[PDB]
Symmetry: D2
Subunit: 326 residues, 4 copies
Amino acid sequence: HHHHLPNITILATGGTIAGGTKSNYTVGKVGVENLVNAVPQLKDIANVKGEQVVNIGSQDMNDNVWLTLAKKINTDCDKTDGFVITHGTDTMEETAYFLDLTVKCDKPVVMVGAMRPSTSMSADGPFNLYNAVVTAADKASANRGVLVVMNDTVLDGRDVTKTNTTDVATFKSVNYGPLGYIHNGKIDYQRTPARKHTSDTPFDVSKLNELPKVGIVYNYANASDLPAKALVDAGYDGIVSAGVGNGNLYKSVFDTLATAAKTGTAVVRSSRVPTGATTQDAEVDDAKYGFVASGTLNPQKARVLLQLALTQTKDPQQIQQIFNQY
Amino acid sequence: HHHHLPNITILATGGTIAGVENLVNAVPQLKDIANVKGEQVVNIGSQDMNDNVWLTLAKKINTDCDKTDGFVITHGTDTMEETAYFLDLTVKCDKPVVMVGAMRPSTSMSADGPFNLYNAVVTAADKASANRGVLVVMNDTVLDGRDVTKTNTTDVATFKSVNYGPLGYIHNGKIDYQRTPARKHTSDTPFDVSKLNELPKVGIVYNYANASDLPAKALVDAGYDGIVSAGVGNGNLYKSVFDTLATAAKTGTAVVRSSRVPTGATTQDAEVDDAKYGFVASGTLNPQKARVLLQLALTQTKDPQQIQQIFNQY
Amino acid sequence: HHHHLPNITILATGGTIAGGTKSNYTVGKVGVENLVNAVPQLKDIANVKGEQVVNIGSQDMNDNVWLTLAKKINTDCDKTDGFVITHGTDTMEETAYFLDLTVKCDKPVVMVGAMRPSTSMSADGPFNLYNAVVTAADKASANRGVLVVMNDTVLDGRDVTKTNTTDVATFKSVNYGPLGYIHNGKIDYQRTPARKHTSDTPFDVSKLNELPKVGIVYNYANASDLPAKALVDAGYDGIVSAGVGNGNLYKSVFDTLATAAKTGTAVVRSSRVPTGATTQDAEVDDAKYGFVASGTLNPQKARVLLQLALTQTKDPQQIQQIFNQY
Amino acid sequence: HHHHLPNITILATGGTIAGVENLVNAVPQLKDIANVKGEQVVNIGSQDMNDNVWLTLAKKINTDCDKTDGFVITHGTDTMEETAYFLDLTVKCDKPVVMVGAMRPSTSMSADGPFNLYNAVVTAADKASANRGVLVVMNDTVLDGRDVTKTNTTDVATFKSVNYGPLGYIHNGKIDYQRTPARKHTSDTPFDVSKLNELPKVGIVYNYANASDLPAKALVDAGYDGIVSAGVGNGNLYKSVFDTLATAAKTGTAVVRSSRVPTGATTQDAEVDDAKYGFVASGTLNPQKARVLLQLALTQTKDPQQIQQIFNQY
């Protein structure tokens, strides 16, 4: 019997996270080719093949890259044993949740990035990529949804968020914790997300050319209603409020979003507060105003779900149910 | 000798957390530590906190400093971190100003408001509290007004100084202070609001994947004096937002790059050429905090180099 | 159809956590009777009955109380819909894990305490007890093992630990996070512990009169071997090391525990470090020395498992397997 | 004018983290910020750190202070928090002493040791680092030697000042310091180890349900000069342990109550009558930290009231 390693596909969306114990290779025009050459220890754990999907800073991540990724994984599922997606850290948490809601492929999808440049002292990218491959290759990684692997830790795509502007340990599942820790190429999984994901969602992006327009507005003392008014005047399909405290709104932002909801604009109350749910049954009478409470979804994560909800329905009661199940 | 208690003034901005002259009744243990007098400044949910209440408060503390030994400000939790930093920069009174709220209603099981008020008054009464700037006292902890922020939507322990930690912990009506803010505050600032009836218009825009430039453009078209960006990661901007704010920063709109990320600095010398664009990096000030210091910076200067030095010192 | 509330039994082990909006009742000699009168809102959610098992400070918690509790729950399971155990906070995390490993009853067991005295301003006990009852009454609480409810949060008995000496928010599942948050009497459960618990363990305490002798020793610079020697000289069945870093031992403590393991004393390496696993395959050659690595079990939690392991086997390979499954 | 770099001395206590004269090679960016000279003091895993190495180090820094502008101590992570506090109390040199280690081997993928060393040397070279006591630099953060502790078994970000927060963050070879330890350190302590070849014997005992008194009794029978209790909760003791330590505290054994709980003070005026029993409360010092200050307190006094005041000031 021949030992056979799993086939893992690396989909690249940006710059390389591994590069400058340096392996000696000829740098080519394809970033993902350079990455794999930078981390030759990948051969000990997987048969790796890399495709460069786009090449952007994740601060310029957008709906089209999302649809391109979901469709590619869903189309390519039978050709590999697992996927690693190399991504900028700034919006990795949004991409991860979009893919958590739209991937129908039943093999592991693992997102990975680097908080330090590949050229810097003590670059984190090489060992992060090695651990993302470990994760993607582990049969125990299946049926856990789309994952993020950073800093030796397996994180679910729904709760993971960037907590610190610079720290290599920045990625944390701040409400419900990580799924498993990685030591010496092995994962001890003690949790799985209960919210429905991947093949258990109704979201089917296979034929979509675009996503519903959903914008985010911020609340603070003496908040302007000019941003909320701008999104309404453009006919936005939905607005996510980054509310103060438990999803509360400055009165002038409240007044604009109540009027919008009455015309049929979907309105989701989230919070600028970095941990904890925007709860139903607090100080806002959601049912009266036609508003949706986001739960533990932060504003950027609430936008991802609301866009997908709006491919299915514009009924705020149906949108609330989606916000309570996914 | 007759033992004398310090005179503490509670200024109320909302409902009761434990009305405002009543509080000697509601928490009678306050009589053991202070002579408390109460005044109602305004009565609003802090989600509707505004520039007018800020100016009223700074003016009230500054004018009434001689009359009392310390102030406690009762306030809603939602925007307490904004008001604390606003007062931190505009108070000139050299006596403790301590903000306090409650995460559970006064009428609720295990309401946190009573003990929080008790510990706020302990803090305002402690001579060791002087010269530490405006404070926030919540869950047995003394927090500096610059770093303090609401970290959880519902948890009584929500208030944390998430970058530099608390100044002290309160046990048995005593504080063991082990820290004090280095950044300049109170009477070491140039900000003097004694004569202002309004503050510069400063708006906040959010960054995320596929971010619309319509918010940024709505503020630029209104002639806002400044815009704070809640950027991604290390203060980065979605391209369309970056385009609009690059245009604003050379047309009379100050632009501060902050971050939607809950901890850590938005740094100079990262991915953004701040000098080319006329932008200011916020450092550890989160977007709503950076808004406070931008509004106060704009009372003094419109020069981006000068605003960046204010962001570097306060 | 009559609305019927669940029957919940409160087993008390110490002082009351609710007492001095004060309800007016006559204080009796039974602490748990006074507790229920202190929290009259319990009637809105449950038919509550209370038994005082012992009355101790949890700093004096001990094996006999553990056996008395497991046997009482296992014997009384058919007489109620759920159990709340009122306990001191100091050792609640140890009790919770013991009960997580020995309860065979398939109804919720929820442990609760208070970080402030029942008589103090802003006492936490009343609302904690109300939330423990909510938890014990929720059908969604079943099959999650033994639980701790503190500060509006449902925590699994394995990972929960006391993180702060005074904070009402002190209880956290520091490695894998909470199971669910409680808002307005309702729980949004998003996690369940993967490690085997309750009816899926082999531990059966029904007939035990005592538990194997397991002690704990601490590592630090210039550590004394006198404590480890004392436990060996007494014929302790097991020793748990609170190691430095990844379960490392000062050489003189190492030497004493290696000699002990050779005579058949079970030795488990844990860590004084408050988060993270004591891993296999680090700097200690466990297999050579006959040592067991504790994983994410802190020293006090490793003792609870090792005592129960030693009712089943004294084979260090079998004890490791138990430390990898429960 | 010719620009001059500061002279930095690395003292090594173990293997390389990036031998000790080599490190100018291994991290050549060090040549841009300092003139580095390396000396090997000892070469041990920090799990075997001991009183002899502590005395050697304090004596070496104190004697060699004039010779250099700053020291970096390379050390194993397991007992770094103990050595840092020991040096924090015994260093009299008024120049920065910065400890550093690595959570991944030098030979491992994405080893943390290089950048950690680079940032340690930045810290030791910064004039702003002076007068802040002995420091620990790990994961882009400057941490005070009193509060710093290892919070995770394997995480590169393990070192945190868990009660009072970091002093500053390091970005692009610069530090923005916003805090400094209030507790007395270095040349503001009475502890002088220049003439000591040994330290008082101080042992640590653990509390948990059904705790054996055999550890405590083994230390008492050996005639230990002090015992630190890693108590439950707020420094509480299992009854049998309490009985043995109550006996010790009036028979020539100093007893400090600390806590196995990872954050928060063991307070005076809680469940234990410290005065009746002759016990000392450790405050925020965790058991291994309290051991350091007890050993140094016992060089000066055996009086429990006097030890408690040392625990209240250092």
